[PDB]
């Protein structure tokens, strides 16, 4: 109904005739363009709307799509015999009629400064992000720099965590040298984002095994807390760190050297559900049956008031099943759940609101496991002041 709708209808069509292997595709896609042509017909273009039905603007209006159902029809009878590529270079040929018949009523007054509105809104939304991922970065580069080397680095909790957050910071890094690098013999640096790429999808699985780990090693570790192991997990500590490796890196490292196009790889189907998409469900999977055994025996010390409301383990508690549906749920919206293509316009609402998310998503984790931690917090002030003391009795030394 909507000329946009339609107009977006022609243009995807255009690409799938573009991209087309096979007769049938390039027929399909056709026969989508002749209906949304016929639809646009009967619509009225932003500059034509103060303009009579009648007007020999919307007669010419018109005309343009009656001479673009034409070459639609042409096309359709090469497809018809067969002949893909001639039917793909008819193809071509729509947008000169389109040009010079259509496009001059859409490009008006108030519609070309529309343009410029729309894509102020989207660089916007290009730093919005670059913020959002900067800050997560230096918020994970502080939150390890304390933890890191410390009467903390002692723990071995402050370790499954020192990794969770490696597991951010390479993907937050890495989202910001494929952003870099996009906007810039030459080779020298397009090849340069490429090895990047792999350390992204590489540590977009990895911050789900240490997402595996934290919801484990609440069960396995504090929610037991009847079992003698404890420290000598490093067998499965950072070798969990080895599952979003194993069924990732061949995955895509293989699958990419046979059908490589840009720096960020688009989707291959084939390619990218075996990449990724298994080891990241294979862990919000078996991270869910933990979690409601996690709450299960939780309410338990509720009555047994094991767990108190100022227990180290209850606070935890209230912080990694804070992370564990949150992160989980809302970058498992991300692959499949508004699984149509249905159009461009509704598919990048949907990339740039995971992009919005996605990116200040280790800023969260290093507040809540780290910033938000009594011990956490004490220590801190505890050796700035013992640090101020040392400056003091330093000066009076000398």
């Known amino acids: 109904a909507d000329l946009e709708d339609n107009w977006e209808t022609l243009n995807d069509n255009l690409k799938v005739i573009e991209k087309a292997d ?45 001479i673009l159902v034409g070459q639609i029809d042409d096309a359709l009878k090469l497809a018809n ?3 893909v590529k001639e039917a793909q270079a008819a193809a071509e040929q729509l947008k000169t009629t389109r040009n010079a018949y259509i496009q001059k009523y859409l490009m008006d007054g108030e519609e070309i400064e529309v343009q410029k509105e729309v894509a102020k809104m989207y ?5 919005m992000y670059t913020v959002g991922y900067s800050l997560s970065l ?77 919801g484990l090693y609440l069960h ?51 390619g990218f559900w075996w990449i990724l998409r298994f080891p990241v469900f294979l862990a919000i999977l078996i991270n ?19 767990m108190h409301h100022t227990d180290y383990k209850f606070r935890l508690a209230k912080s990694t099943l804070t992370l564990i549906p949150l992160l989980g749920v809302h970058e498992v919206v991300f692959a499949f759940v508004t699984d149509e293509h249905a159009q461009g ?3 990048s609402a949907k990339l740039f609101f995971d992009l919005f998310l996605s990116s200040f998503q280790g800023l969260l984790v290093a507040v809540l496991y780290c910033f938000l ?19 003091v009795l330093w000066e009076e030394r000398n």
């Open 138 to 214: 230096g918020a994970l580069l502080l939150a390890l720099a304390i933890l890191g080397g410390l009467s903390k680095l002692h723990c071995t909790r402050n370790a499954i965590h020192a990794n969770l957050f490696a597991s951010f910071v390479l993907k937050a890094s890495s989202v910001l040298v494929i952003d870099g690098l996009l906007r810039t013999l030459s080779d020298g640096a397009v090849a340069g984002c490429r090895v990047a790429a792999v350390f992204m999808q590489y540590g977009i699985v990895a911050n789900y095994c240490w997402l595996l780990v934290e």
């Open 22 to 66: 096979n007769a049938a595709q390039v027929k399909d896609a056709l026969t989508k363009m002749r209906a949304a042509a016929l639809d646009a017909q009967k619509a009225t273009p932003p500059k034509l709307e103060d303009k009579s039905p009648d007007s020999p603007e919307m007669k010419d209006f018109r005309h343009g799509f009656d």
């Open 373 to 391: 931690n009594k011990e956490v917090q004490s220590e801190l002030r505890r050796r700035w002041h013992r640090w101020r003391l040392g400056k």
């Open 288 to 306: 869910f049956f933990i979690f409601v055994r996690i709450v299960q025996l939780l309410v338990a010390k509720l009555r047994a008031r094991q």
């Open 220 to 270: 396995n570790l504090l929610g037991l807390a009847t079992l003698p192991e404890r420290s000598f997990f490093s067998l499965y500590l950072g070798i969990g760190w080895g599952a979003p490796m194993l069924f990732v890196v061949p995955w895509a490292v293989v699958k990419c050297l046979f059908e490589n196009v840009q720096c960020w790889t688009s989707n291959d189907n084939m």
């Open 81 to 83: 015999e067969g002949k």
């Open 345 to 347: 316009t509704l598919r």
């Open 123 to 127: 660089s916007s939304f290009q730093v």
